[model samples]
Target chain A: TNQLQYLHKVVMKALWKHQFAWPFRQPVDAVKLGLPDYHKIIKQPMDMGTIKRRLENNYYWAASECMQDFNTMFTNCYIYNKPTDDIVLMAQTLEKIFLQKVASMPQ
Target chain B: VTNQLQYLHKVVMKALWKHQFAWPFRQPVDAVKLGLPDYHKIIKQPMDMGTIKRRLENNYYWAASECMQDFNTMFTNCYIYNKPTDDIVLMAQTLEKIFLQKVASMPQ
Candidate 1:
């Protein structure tokens, strides 16, 4: 169904989107998956503007903190010997909740 | 005195932790804390984004980013922000209602 298809695309993008000057370090495996990483230029000094922006968006972007867990779920349930359908089930649920958050924001 | 709200707090956090897959970055309410018998109580209900926005005005936390204003303005710019779909809007209110529950649960 298109719902699943669109959900998959959004999930892939969220899991794999790349941005320049992204604050946190990206994982190597994610890069290997053709996923992009946040590599902010060191030339830019830390400033209040950056800090404030991060503060506002911190919760939004903090999904990155779940990267490892998400990757683990993907690996264990998605790629490696597949697990129960419940894997995609809950991830989809999580995505649904998060989509509401990201869908409302400027990308 | 037996504190119902204290009991409510425990129930709410448990529900939230059990929820595990929900978000909007707001501190979500655990439905059980609201004195509901079960999670299914409000499962079918949907909230309007406009109505939800009005409630958020009283709270300081609902402020938005640049293009993102308050709930109404944010929901207004659904093109940029995702349109508050039925379930999404309901979920937002669910969070708001939970927070309101917490507020009421507080002692004056």
Candidate 2:
């Protein structure tokens, strides 16, 4: 049903509007960043753009599945960047927000 | 040279236990308590320093490479379960490097 899909969109839109969403808006360019080991360390990479596209195409069967992708995005950031790095901090902050919104999402 | 191999294993294990970053890898992960429901499913063979210690004491390893494989499995499991930037992952990587270097410096 579009009911849950609309709710998922609501959460994704909030995350899209968040200030810390910039770093995770798209896939990390490992070559451009000179991080040759990025792909090696992060076996599964994810980002907001991919999630958005997935949501638009009705790829997510459940909101939990959608949130899993969001978590993958955050986990990838943590895997590629140092914990002290600004981008990592951004991921952490946004992950907390994403979780809170998911918890409070309408049933 | 089994005696020598056993001695080398003890030395390396002692060093790993003493290292500051060894805390997380010292024991098997508490999957249920740590909220890692999928840990057992992901990590088919979970290894830890304590288990290695027990195995070593019980003469469970026939060759140094067998022990090395266990250590590798422990670290690999950490990488699989944790983000690379996490302190636990960093610790595992550091300890893995130290373990390899120690093994390399030992006589064959």
Candidate 3:
């Protein structure tokens, strides 16, 4: 039902995978290229609704109409397309158990 | 080591939701929905017609493509391209689903 994951994946593919930096650069640096001072743009407070709507519109507008849900749409848009608000909330609720840093959790 | 709400967030906080208790038995209560209503609200986006006309000239190409898709969906197919924000057609269609419609109704 929620389409956030897929949307994040595809769009961020090049950036996350460093695809265009083919011969010269590594995958991690791909997201770094178009994202000079990228942290600022991404760090903007997640406007949840807009993210979903934009993903829907972007995929359709870009002629990837077959896409509909979060999982299928995310990989093409971004790498490691994990939009786990549930985990974050759980972390907040169970701070003592789950660490604050996301990586401390799992794949 | 287990997952649970923070001490301040827990204890069955007794959160109450007070809304108009709509009870529809005879007819769906046609509560007059208001938008920028009651007090005459107007979202006047500051614009000068002259400037808007000039801007339109700069970017108006999508009109044909955009409107055509919508018109075809609405009029030709008799389906909605756009609906009320809350309308979820995928889920809404479940109401009339007749899975294996009367395959064994014992026609009388």
Candidate 4:
């Protein structure tokens, strides 16, 4: 389990270092984005910072659970933004990168 | 368009309900009996297949995305409350995969 937690930390560090991960590093700002209904639409809002904190606090029990937050972060982007939106594309790119890293992790 | 989306949502809900691992997710988690006092706090938006079914019957979803969000919540909540190695978590992931596949094959 500690090994899995270590792997999760490594994965999160890589994600944070990625350029496309900037927008998703923190929770979405509904008021600033003028998306008053953002919270309503995206029920399970997630972000890299939250994931990092959760990891540090030992909130994740496994790699898959940790990865699910990453998935949720990207999925929320897709839900709130149009398919053609740049943010959505960024999410797509970052998600692809994250998934590839996850695929390489030891099971 | 609304009717079409509702129909598809109903079909998807039915598929999820019939899965063998669907028992844990059929209704809201009984936090009290489960001794998970933090379950509700951790899972902001509790959801279940049964609730989704009722929502569909009552026309609660305005769009397909709304319906999909509920499905996502149901699975996500499971992950949040249960350990990844837990049987229920694996079941949730499996059911989630099936749901995503169905959505992928769905007509836009």
TM-score of each: 0.20, 0.51, 0.15, 0.52
Give the distance in Å from residue A36's predicted Cα in candidate 1 to where it truly belongs. 39
Error of 1 at A5 (Å): 18
Per-residue lDDT of A21 in model 1: 18
| C-alpha lDDT of candidate 4 relative to the true structure | 0.69
Whose DockQ is greatest here? Answer: 2
Model 4: TM-score, first chain: 0.91
What lDDT does candidate 1 reach at residue A81?
17
lDDT of 3 by residue, B2-92 (tens): 1112110121111100111111111211225422232112111222212222323354323322211221121111112112222332222
Instruction: Compose the digit string of candidate 3's lDDT tens values, residues A66-91.
Output: 22221121211221212232422221
- Could you tell me the lDDT of residue A47 within candidate 4? 94
Q: What is the C-alpha lDDT of each candidate?
A: 0.31, 0.70, 0.23, 0.69
Model 1 agreement with the true structure over B6-94: per-residue lDDT tens digits:
33234433343344233532333345564545333423222233333333333323222211123222222211122223355445434
- List residue ranges in candidate 2 displaced over 4 A: A1-107
- Give per-residue CA lDDT, model 4, range A1-107, as digits (tens): 74355445677777788888888888999999899988877777899889888888888765657766777776567556654468765775676556445434544
Q: Which candidate, 1 or 2, would have the higher DockQ against the true structure?
A: 2
Chain B only, TM-score of each candidate = 0.30, 0.91, 0.19, 0.90
